Amino acid sequence: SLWGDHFLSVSLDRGEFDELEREIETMKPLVKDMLMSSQSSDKEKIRLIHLLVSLGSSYHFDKEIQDILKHSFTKLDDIIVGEDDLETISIMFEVFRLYGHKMSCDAFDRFRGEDGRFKESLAKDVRGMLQLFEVAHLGTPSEDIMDEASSFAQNHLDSWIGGNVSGATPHLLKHIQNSLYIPRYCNIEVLVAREYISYYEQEEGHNKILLKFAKLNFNFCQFHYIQELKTLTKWWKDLDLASKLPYIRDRLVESHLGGLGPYFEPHYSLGRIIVAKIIMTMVVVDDTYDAHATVPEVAVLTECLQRLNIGADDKLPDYLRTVLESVFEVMGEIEQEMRPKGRSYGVKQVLERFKNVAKADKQLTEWARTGDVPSFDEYMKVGLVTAGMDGYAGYCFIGMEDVSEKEAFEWLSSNPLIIQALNVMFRLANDVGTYETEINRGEVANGLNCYMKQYGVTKEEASQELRKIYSNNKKVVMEEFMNSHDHVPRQVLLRCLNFARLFDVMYTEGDGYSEPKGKIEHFMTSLYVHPIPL
Ligand SMILES: [Mg+2]
Ligand SMILES: [Mg+2]
Known part of the structure; x- marks a missing residue:
């Protein structure tokens, strides 16, 4: 809804794409000579x-x-x-x-x-x-x-x-x-x-070759991003959830940024589109776990996400049926796409890993529905599950043909300390950054509010305390990232490091945090609209 329309209608000259690629290919041996120089x-x-x-x-x-x-x-x-x-x-x-x-x-x-x-x-x-x-x-x-x-x-x-x-x-x-x-x-x-x-x-x-190379590289990268947003927007529009549902948020750009943070390169283009589709889809599910859903509604919603089906019918209301139907149809479609590329197993894991997120979401809602504000320590045991970084990492691996499904998803369910530290970073960054949105919905159980209630401290002081917990776990991410080299493929580890860097980008605000939308508006056009003048 209005960067949507923009990308739907932007003109992407394939000739220019081809020329960028060609000029990059031509300069590449010169740059490689610089690296290999005796x-x-x-x-x-x-x-x-x-x-x-x-x-x-x-x-x-x-x-x-x-x-x-x-x-x-x-x-x-x-x-x-x-x-x-x-x-x-x-x-x-x-x-x-x-x-x-x-x-x-x-x-x-x-x-x-x-x-x-x-x-x-x-x-x-x-x-x-x-x-x-x-x-x-x-x-x-x-x-x-x-x-x-x-x-x-x-x-x-x-x-x-x-x-x-x-x-x-x-x-x-x-x-x-x-x-x-x-x-x-x-x-x-x-x-x-x-x-x-x-x-x-x-x-x-400054080296003129390297400068020019870098500009060509950026413009080429940006071309993919605009095409990816074009593709995403068309796909979201066709799905047409806006018709069948009252509360659809605008998450196009944020969701693309959810793939771009993890990997920016041209060859992860497919990976970004897959990640963005999953995120845009899971936002709607997340939005459905709402305090204003009744106890039976959320019970049935959560059960259907355990069974991964389609009611039966011994079941409930229209917009909720529509959400469950859409999620299953989208994941089914993505799995069909990746099947020829031998990546259907990874797509299947999406809703498998979400099962415990749904269960956790159900508890959050109960807290929100009754207005219970648990202790920060009890909250976090649920919040770290809803953060689902093992899920998010899984999304990114799907489109990476340079990553064995077997190694990656084996690593993930070994519950790596680094995924554990990322869970903390996301949960805290998200809860503080989206605070006033949380309070204006009924979502009274969140990391900031739960900390304020436990220690009698103010929003500002709680914020500063959560920040320190965030920095500690960021340092843990860095250590795990280095430590795990030659044990875990680097292409896997860099996603993890990039999750940490993306979370800073999206949520931190000086000593922080804030909403992603305001941060995105700072770099929107430089990233997604204007090419570097050659
Ligand atoms: Mg919610
Ligand atoms: Mg939250």
Whole structure:
């Protein structure tokens, strides 16, 4: 409903698609030559890899990059001997950790005096401190120093921004402003890329090949996004739930963003469409678990989602029948689609995993219906189930032909700690961010309200407490992401890391949280409407 119409009618010239692809293919060997150069050091190769990451362009060379870093990491102690450049050490820290190599925080010892810890002379180094700030979001639970580093960097950068010399380099100033407001690893890959392109263009001595490559890459990525939204909108319109149901929310863009966060690349296009269809469908189910549904209505709804059928008829009312029918028809359809691609098992798991979510949803509704506000601790035992991150991860795997159904869904039902930590991040981010919407519906049982009631604290203070629980679990996600490398396929692990980054994007608001719709409006047109001028 009105970005709907927009994408329904936007003109997508296939000729332009083809030309973008062609020019990307043509430039690719030149960029790969840069990576494989015998003439550059390990250090220079890491700088390049960082730049490719920054520009959303590393995935074209993932094989080569992973191998370069696997070798380079074994020589890491050697490489940093005598390396006292803050930006360099910090760039290395980002790259190895992003790639599942736990570079030690001891590398930062050299920038620390004997105390406070971080050296005050690290302030002529504005570029170095920017990267230090950035990598302060790549900590492990035990790594207390990162939080020290985050504060150090922010304070001194804030002072630099405030104004003397700041002005003399506007483009740099703006970039640092953007980073402090939205840290790279509190942002999603493609938006990081879109902004870095603008920054890098203004950098004296920027590589012209890499810049152009990055622009072509973004425009090509964006073409897929617009086509995906076009496809989604047509599909949603045909389904026509708006006719048969009174309360259909507008979740088109948010739902696409629900696939784009997890993976931005062109080859996960199908994966994004599948994830977006499932999310848009499950929103309607979620909306149906409403305090204003009666005890019998929710009992029968929940039972039908246990049986995965279609009443019988010994059953209930029209709009609810319509919801159950639609969910089963959509999942049945998606399963039919993926069957030739050998992915029907994964589609089947969607409603299998939702079974316990429905049961949990039933309890939330009972609380909401009677106006019971449980303790925050009792709430969370139910809330972590409704968060369903094992379900969400499952949605993303369906469209990934580079992921064995057997390994992925085996991993998932082993209940990985990382899916457990993501459940906490989502549940808390969602409940705080959508609070006033929750209160204006009858949904009085939520993480914020339950915390406020337990500790007699105010909305603001509760919020700040939940934030800290969120940050702890984010650090857990990072640790699990690194730890699980060479045990769990990297393409699986990156979805998980990207869930964390997407949740920051959508719900965090300074010290946070807020509704996704307002955050999306900030980057809507840059992502989904306007291409980069070539
Ligand atoms: Mg609900
Ligand atoms: Mg909620």
